[PDB]
Amino acid sequence: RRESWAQSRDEQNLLQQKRIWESPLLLAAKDNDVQALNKLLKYEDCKVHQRGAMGETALHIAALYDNLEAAMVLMEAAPELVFEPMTSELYEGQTALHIAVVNQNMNLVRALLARRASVSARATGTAFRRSPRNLIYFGEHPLSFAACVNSEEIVRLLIEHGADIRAQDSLGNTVLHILILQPNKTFACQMYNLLLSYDRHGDHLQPLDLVPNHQGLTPFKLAGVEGNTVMFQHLMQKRKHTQWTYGPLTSTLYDLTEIDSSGDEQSLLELIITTKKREARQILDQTPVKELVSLKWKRYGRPYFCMLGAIYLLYIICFTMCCIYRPLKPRTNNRTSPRDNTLLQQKLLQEAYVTPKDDIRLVGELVTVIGAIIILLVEVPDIFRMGVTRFFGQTILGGPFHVLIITYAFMVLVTMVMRLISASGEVVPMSFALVLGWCNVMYFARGFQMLGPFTIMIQKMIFGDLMRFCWLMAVVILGFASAFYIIFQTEDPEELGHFYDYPMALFSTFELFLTIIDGPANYNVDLPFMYSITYAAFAIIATLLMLNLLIAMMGDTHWRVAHERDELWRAQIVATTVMLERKLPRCLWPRSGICGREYGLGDRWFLRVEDRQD
Amino acid sequence: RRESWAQSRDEQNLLQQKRIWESPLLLAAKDNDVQALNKLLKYEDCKVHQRGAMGETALHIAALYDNLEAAMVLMEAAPELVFEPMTSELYEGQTALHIAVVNQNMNLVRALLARRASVSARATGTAFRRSPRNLIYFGEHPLSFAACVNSEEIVRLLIEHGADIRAQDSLGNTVLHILILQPNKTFACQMYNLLLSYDRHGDHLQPLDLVPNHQGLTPFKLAGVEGNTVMFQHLMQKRKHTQWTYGPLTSTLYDLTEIDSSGDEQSLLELIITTKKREARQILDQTPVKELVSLKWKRYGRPYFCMLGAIYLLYIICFTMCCIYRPLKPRTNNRTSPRDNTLLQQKLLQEAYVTPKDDIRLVGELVTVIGAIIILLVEVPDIFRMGVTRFFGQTILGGPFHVLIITYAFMVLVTMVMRLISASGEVVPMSFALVLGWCNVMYFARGFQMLGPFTIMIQKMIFGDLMRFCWLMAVVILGFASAFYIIFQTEDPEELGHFYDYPMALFSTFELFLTIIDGPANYNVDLPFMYSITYAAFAIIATLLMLNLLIAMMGDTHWRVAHERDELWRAQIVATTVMLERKLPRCLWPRSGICGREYGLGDRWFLRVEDRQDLNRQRIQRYAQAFHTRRSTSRSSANWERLRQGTLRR
Amino acid sequence: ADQLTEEQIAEFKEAFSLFDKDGDGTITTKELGTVMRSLGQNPTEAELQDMINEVDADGNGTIDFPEFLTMMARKMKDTDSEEEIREAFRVFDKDGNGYISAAELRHVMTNLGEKLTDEEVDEMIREADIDGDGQVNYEEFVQMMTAK
Ligand SMILES: CC(C)CCC[C@@H](C)[C@H]1CC[C@H]2[C@@H]3CC=C4C[C@@H](OC(=O)CCC(=O)O)CC[C@]4(C)[C@H]3CC[C@]12C
Ligand SMILES: CC(C)CCC[C@@H](C)[C@H]1CC[C@H]2[C@@H]3CC=C4C[C@@H](OC(=O)CCC(=O)O)CC[C@]4(C)[C@H]3CC[C@]12C
Ligand SMILES: CC(C)CCC[C@@H](C)[C@H]1CC[C@H]2[C@@H]3CC=C4C[C@@H](OC(=O)CCC(=O)O)CC[C@]4(C)[C@H]3CC[C@]12C
Ligand SMILES: CC(C)CCC[C@@H](C)[C@H]1CC[C@H]2[C@@H]3CC=C4C[C@@H](OC(=O)CCC(=O)O)CC[C@]4(C)[C@H]3CC[C@]12C
Ligand SMILES: CC(C)CCC[C@@H](C)[C@H]1CC[C@H]2[C@@H]3CC=C4C[C@@H](O)CC[C@]4(C)[C@H]3CC[C@]12C
Ligand SMILES: CC(C)CCC[C@@H](C)[C@H]1CC[C@H]2[C@@H]3CC=C4C[C@@H](O)CC[C@]4(C)[C@H]3CC[C@]12C
Ligand SMILES: CC(C)CCC[C@@H](C)[C@H]1CC[C@H]2[C@@H]3CC=C4C[C@@H](O)CC[C@]4(C)[C@H]3CC[C@]12C
Ligand SMILES: [Ca+2]
Ligand SMILES: [Ca+2]
Ligand SMILES: [Ca+2]
Numbered sequence A: 001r002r003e004s005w006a007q008s009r010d011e012q013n014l015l016q017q018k019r020i021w022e023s024p025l026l027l028a029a030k031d032n033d034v035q036a037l038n039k040l041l042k043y044e045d046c047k048v049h050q051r052g053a054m055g056e057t058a059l060h061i062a063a064l065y066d067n068l069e070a071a072m073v074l075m076e077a078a079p080e081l082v083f084e085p086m087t088s089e090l091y092e093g094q095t096a097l098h099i100a101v102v103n104q105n106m107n108l109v110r111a112l113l114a115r116r117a118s119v120s121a122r123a124t125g126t127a128f129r130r131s132p133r134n135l136i137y138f139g140e141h142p143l144s145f146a147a148c149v150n151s152e153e154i155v156r157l158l159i160e161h162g163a164d165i166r167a168q169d170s171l172g173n174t175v176l177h178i179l180i181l182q183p184n185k186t187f188a189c190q191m192y193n194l195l196l197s198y199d200r201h202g203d204h205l206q207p208l209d210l211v212p213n214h215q216g217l218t219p220f221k222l223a224g225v226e227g228n229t230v231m232f233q234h235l236m237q238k239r240k241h242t243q244w245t246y247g248p249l250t251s252t253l254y255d256l257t258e259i260d261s262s263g264d265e266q267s268l269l270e271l272i273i274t275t276k277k278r279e280a281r282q283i284l285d286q287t288p289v290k291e292l293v294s295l296k297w298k299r300y301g302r303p304y305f306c307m308l309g310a311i312y313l314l315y316i317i318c319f320t321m322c323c324i325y326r327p328l329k330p331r332t333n334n335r336t337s338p339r340d341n342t343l344l345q346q347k348l349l350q351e352a353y354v355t356p357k358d359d360i361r362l363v364g365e366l367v368t369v370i371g372a373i374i375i376l377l378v379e380v381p382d383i384f385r386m387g388v389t390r391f392f393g394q395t396i397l398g399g400p401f402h403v404l405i406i407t408y409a410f411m412v413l414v415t416m417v418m419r420l421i422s423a424s425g426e427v428v429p430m431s432f433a434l435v436l437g438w439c440n441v442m443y444f445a446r447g448f449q450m451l452g453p454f455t456i457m458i459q460k461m462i463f464g465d466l467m468r469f470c471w472l473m474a475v476v477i478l479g480f481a482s483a484f485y486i487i488f489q490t491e492d493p494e495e496l497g498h499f500y501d502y503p504m505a506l507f508s509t510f511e512l513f514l515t516i517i518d519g520p521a522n523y524n525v526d527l528p529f530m531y532s533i534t535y536a537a538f539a540i541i542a543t544l545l546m547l548n549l550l551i552a553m554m555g556d557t558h559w560r561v562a563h564e565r566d567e568l569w570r571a572q573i574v575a576t577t578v579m580l581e582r583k584l585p586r587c588l589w590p591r592s593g594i595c596g597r598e599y600g601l602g603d604r605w606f607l608r609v610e611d612r613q614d
Numbered sequence B: 001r002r003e004s005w006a007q008s009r010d011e012q013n014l015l016q017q018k019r020i021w022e023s024p025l026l027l028a029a030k031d032n033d034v035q036a037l038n039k040l041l042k043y044e045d046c047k048v049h050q051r052g053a054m055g056e057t058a059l060h061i062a063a064l065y066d067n068l069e070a071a072m073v074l075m076e077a078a079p080e081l082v083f084e085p086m087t088s089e090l091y092e093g094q095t096a097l098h099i100a101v102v103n104q105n106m107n108l109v110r111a112l113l114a115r116r117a118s119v120s121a122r123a124t125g126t127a128f129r130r131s132p133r134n135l136i137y138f139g140e141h142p143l144s145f146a147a148c149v150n151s152e153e154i155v156r157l158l159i160e161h162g163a164d165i166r167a168q169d170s171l172g173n174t175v176l177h178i179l180i181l182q183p184n185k186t187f188a189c190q191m192y193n194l195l196l197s198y199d200r201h202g203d204h205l206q207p208l209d210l211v212p213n214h215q216g217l218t219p220f221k222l223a224g225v226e227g228n229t230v231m232f233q234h235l236m237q238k239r240k241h242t243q244w245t246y247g248p249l250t251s252t253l254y255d256l257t258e259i260d261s262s263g264d265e266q267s268l269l270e271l272i273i274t275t276k277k278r279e280a281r282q283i284l285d286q287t288p289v290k291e292l293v294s295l296k297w298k299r300y301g302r303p304y305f306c307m308l309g310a311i312y313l314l315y316i317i318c319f320t321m322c323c324i325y326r327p328l329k330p331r332t333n334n335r336t337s338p339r340d341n342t343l344l345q346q347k348l349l350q351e352a353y354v355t356p357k358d359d360i361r362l363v364g365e366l367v368t369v370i371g372a373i374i375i376l377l378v379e380v381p382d383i384f385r386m387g388v389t390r391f392f393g394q395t396i397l398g399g400p401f402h403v404l405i406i407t408y409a410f411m412v413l414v415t416m417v418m419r420l421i422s423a424s425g426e427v428v429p430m431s432f433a434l435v436l437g438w439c440n441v442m443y444f445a446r447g448f449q450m451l452g453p454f455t456i457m458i459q460k461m462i463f464g465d466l467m468r469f470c471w472l473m474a475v476v477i478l479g480f481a482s483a484f485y486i487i488f489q490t491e492d493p494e495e496l497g498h499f500y501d502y503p504m505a506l507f508s509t510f511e512l513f514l515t516i517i518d519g520p521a522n523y524n525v526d527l528p529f530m531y532s533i534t535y536a537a538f539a540i541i542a543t544l545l546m547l548n549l550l551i552a553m554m555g556d557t558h559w560r561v562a563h564e565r566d567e568l569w570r571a572q573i574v575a576t577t578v579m580l581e582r583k584l585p586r587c588l589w590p591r592s593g594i595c596g597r598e599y600g601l602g603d604r605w606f607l608r609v610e611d612r613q614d615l616n617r618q619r620i621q622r623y624a625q626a627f628h629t630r631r632s633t634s635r636s637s638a639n640w641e642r643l644r645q646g647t648l649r650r
Numbered sequence C: 001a002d003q004l005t006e007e008q009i010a011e012f013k014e015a016f017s018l019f020d021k022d023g024d025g026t027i028t029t030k031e032l033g034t035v036m037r038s039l040g041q042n043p044t045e046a047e048l049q050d051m052i053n054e055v056d057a058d059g060n061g062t063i064d065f066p067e068f069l070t071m072m073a074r075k076m077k078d079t080d081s082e083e084e085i086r087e088a089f090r091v092f093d094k095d096g097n098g099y100i101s102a103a104e105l106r107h108v109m110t111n112l113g114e115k116l117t118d119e120e121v122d123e124m125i126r127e128a129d130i131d132g133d134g135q136v137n138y139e140e141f142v143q144m145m146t147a148k
């Protein structure tokens, strides 16, 4: 697992410093050395196309290593170096105007545009694409370089020389898309005003803040996915509208034309719940969003989710009582496989659908089999199209309730098949189907505020505080159950039969680890001497040490992530409201907001709110 | 035997004071008394070489009590007064020039150098040697004193009057070693730069910041072992070789000629891990060393630590199934020991490998004996070399997993003996060798970040809040176990047999402490009346009081040491990578970094780190304008005032 | 500069660090102009010569750290504090560098009980930090212990 990309850059970054030292003009270009430049440029053995490691020339070195006096000599002598991009794979197409802008100013940006630089170039090299492999994502264009380093004097200077205000990039990110996802959120706001102000064209055509990138996201909705909260409240200053101000009581109208899911497009409430960044979910507590989440949920989100929880609750009772009242006949075979080790006295029947009690039960299987098909035709065609167990298998990655309800309906049909062709033991699909089928009532405990943030803590305590504990449980019990087995092996099994064979020894020792049996103690016969020593050490790495450490570890974590488990619950209301918005039919479901036609604002929906500010 | 030392130093300091008052010139020297020194020194019987309780003359008392006016009188009258070091087993060597230096300011130090002073005077006594002893370690030579008292005017005044900037100590420490282990780190940096300025490129073969002490240890490696984070960041600025600055993106080039694990020279990562002084582990979070260990772990450190975590795990299963399928033979005589005290019905075979199933085990048993010797040939040469148990006070006390894996390979070669000489008690060494064998799987849980800081916490409970509990458990279960025994000594042990033997009565009372059995109850025979009282007290102060307090101890500790364990885990990645780099050959482990032959930088290995630095215009505005010449807050601010009166009232 | 404590020297040394972009202790006239351009304002290449030759007492054109340190005594900030606060900072500051850390405030809160989570400790610094580094100065600590 060697990072060969890390070596391949480091083998080249040292190679560039080599090529400058073994070259007379490049070393003179690293420093100023204007006495050394004028000597070499006179003799006609210059080789001004001396091409370095990262495809650089004497003009790229004079601009990267800042030397204004060297670059004046190079442009005056050979002015054809201005029209020269680099050719190496990391820095493709990066001109001399690109480098002199990232050094935040020069007089060279006056001087390069004097001798006809390219204001519209393409820095399409692999060290400029956004990745966890490049420290910067400045874009590709020179006005995208100057806007990200917060240089107003250069941004005003490139439009005057013919910058393109709306030039997209390889990912389709325009200049307004890039400023949002820069790490300095405050100074991005100051450039965001200056960039939009210099458009003012009648050639709008989804003008400058309504132009999407290649994945479809607008500038406003890109702040939704990424998580730039400081950019988000600045974007809402153009959507809102003040209505009246009566004392300390103002009323505004927000514009729900890019937040609310109409019926077809992927809106901002949908894009937050699909992404996985933790900085993306402070947008659920902003001033147009925390009402629209609540007003869908109080009005038409909670009662539809309690009726959909009460149908599933009466569904699983009709699955329980067809497992309580199974067709089950007495045993036909003679026992004869030692009664010293046998208890079985019933057998499965083949055709018991004759009594009127079974005809009432035959309704009960027909309810729970049809219900198992309706599950597999509303959720399994989701993982068909969206992603092969990974993209909509983010629920196979987090929030595991999708996997359980499939596994329930997968094993009602195995219970159907083993009934039809009359196979061997039917208890095996049923025993999963009950414990799977009832533990999805815990899905319907996210609407109730009492039970909401507690179902979070059964998830975050089973994927990292009980899961890391069981790797050092199976280390311990494999040590002791193999130790307790070989002690009680040259010994009588009918009395103290905790360890008579090795699969049982793994299950007696697992029970002593948790104190869910008593302990092997059989006074009136004498146990061997080595047992009381090795059980005393298994009385300590045990109940005493590694069961009270798990109380402290679950007790430590339960107040560390307590701010998070609340705001992880409020994102399980948005995850459910929008889910019922697209799976239920449109007919019940009024659209959230006040239309702007009958009063006259347009066709856009709206939502008003009142507040005191004193 | 050792506390007479603290007395005998305090005997001398009072005996020094008594010799002052019973002397005419010394009492005159303790105060100014400039009328009295001219009165006394015109006499004849006045011993100006008067030795006090340590060797003090009149000029030392004039200097230690900083009487410069009394000092001028004595230098005129006594010629050999800049000379004469002290004699006693305390302060030796120390002349009047040292004392004028240590007081951070004197005009005497300009005066004594005029009067032919003595700057080679090794102040070597029992009061100038670093130890859990004397509160100061300033050095030996007068330049070493003037350096570590923050005296910028005196060090310039010493080198002009013929000093020595290079001369070592008894410990072998130079001047620049002494500056590192002072407790005032940021004033040591300014004196560090000054003492190199007067080196003036000596031809002395690695000039003075490469010279080792008697241990053999450069000044750069002395900031690392001791724990100087301030000095280590300062000493690194000579190493970096910064390449280019593409706007807000730099690319430095560090020098791994002393940091990275070199050959047989003990590198800097091998000296931090084998050292105490917890501040030394702060160096492992520094800008060349954090990026070095992470690039030695992701690449070559983790995939080799899993291929040893899987060979060992297939070794224990090969050893487990040779214990499960061990030879047993049925009981011979016929239950000769009497009934109700004998239930064993097998015994162990003398020598019987004659079946095809045993030759499969004979393959498996030879694997775990060959593997047992290999364990004792890679770690026992450290207990062959560094002592058996008396000279070996290092690795027993340092690493817990060293002991468990030597014990494992000892128990296998006990079973190798007992299988060949045909003994009886083989169920005992295989009882150790399995629990010891499977609990070294806990060793291979430090590379996995999930399981890493959990095994850190377990060894801080065993040697912590469980042996703080096991002493006040053994008090209780020796009291009550002797109480439950004597009550049921006069009873019938056939419906309640938990207490019929005092080894047994220790065993049932220990289980009732942990509630890992039920409890003595019959419900058919009326029990002794004293049992219902003394078990009711034992039910409260075991199950309700002392066990729920042990949850409160492990729950208080776990949120207190909760960022130390993430410091202890990342220091065991370094302890693993250094060990894996040594014992594995060089053919599998490439040396980390980029060489300097083909890139033309020398023979030294480099490491390139690039970092998008920063902004904060507001900071650099404050300094360039000097250059320019002609709600959660309510929760947080509440936490500041709870610190505020919490600090100003203490 | 005859009165400078360990705190302001540890602040000025880090202030010398980000201002110097070649790793040594020499401020060139060029690398002073690198920072000045990043302030938006432009140099004139004689203003750079003006500010260097103002205080270059040895006469090399490269501002060493002692000549940098006595320069900040000329352009001094102030000296007004309390003797108990300066001692209280050196108790908190473990590794003697004139800065408190995120792990150096979780230590102080743990000794006072107080049961702090990792989130509020980073929220304490955002009200303490002035210049915006996530690292409390001495002047940022004096400003909080008596003022707000
Ligand atoms: C024969 C008759 C009685 C059938 C009755 C219908 C119900 C038994 C089933 C049929 C389809 C089921 C629904 C299918 C899809 C889902 C989505 C499912 O979501 C997940 O699995 C997790 C996704 C997430 O993480 O949000 C939650 C249960 C629910 C509402 C199910 C609730 C129970 C329903 C209505
Ligand atoms: C016969 C066949 C199966 C080959 C058997 C060889 C391996 C199964 C054994 C023999 C040598 C063992 C290694 C010998 C030395 C060490 C170092 C040892 O390190 C410590 O205990 C350090 C503890 C600390 O630093 O605190 C941990 C076990 C380990 C990796 C051992 C792992 C298992 C190994 C590779
Ligand atoms: C040092 C570690 C393991 C913890 C120390 C805790 C002690 C308070 C515990 C653990 C070890 C225990 C001892 C381990 C060995 C024995 C011998 C054993 O006595 C028998 O031989 C019982 C007879 C039988 O088992 O049939 C049980 C009691 C006793 C003294 C135990 C009493 C309680 C002890 C001292
Ligand atoms: C602050 C106070 C109230 C502490 C609470 C403790 C009580 C709830 C417990 C502690 C001691 C217990 C007593 C311990 C001893 C006995 C004697 C016991 O024996 C008999 O009297 C029966 C005689 C026989 O067994 O033959 C009956 C229960 C009793 C009163 C127990 C009843 C419950 C008591 C009072
Ligand atoms: C093996 C058979 C017999 C029993 C099945 C039990 C296992 C597979 C099931 C039953 C109970 C289930 C858990 C119950 C509820 C939750 C809370 C939720 O927020 C995350 C998933 C989680 C943690 C489930 C994970 C899967 C689970 C552990
Ligand atoms: C007496 C025989 C029969 C069995 C006794 C086993 C005892 C002595 C052994 C086996 C398991 C061992 C523990 C297993 C795990 C750890 C965690 C490690 O980080 C420190 C050592 C420590 C705490 C071990 C200490 C010693 C230990 C308790
Ligand atoms: C009734 C007989 C048989 C047993 C009753 C035990 C009672 C009376 C005795 C035995 C153990 C004793 C306790 C043991 C330990 C402590 C802690 C110590 O810091 C103060 C005394 C105190 C709190 C004791 C109080 C009295 C006590 C509870
Ligand atoms: Ca019980
Ligand atoms: Ca410079
Ligand atoms: Ca200078």
Ligand SMILES: [Ca+2]
Pocket (backbone or CB within 6 Å): C093, C094, C095, C096, C097, C098, C099, C100, C101, C104
């Ligand atoms: Ca600090």
Ligand SMILES: [Ca+2]
Pocket (backbone or CB within 6 Å): C129, C130, C131, C132, C133, C134, C135, C136, C137, C140
């Ligand atoms: Ca700060």
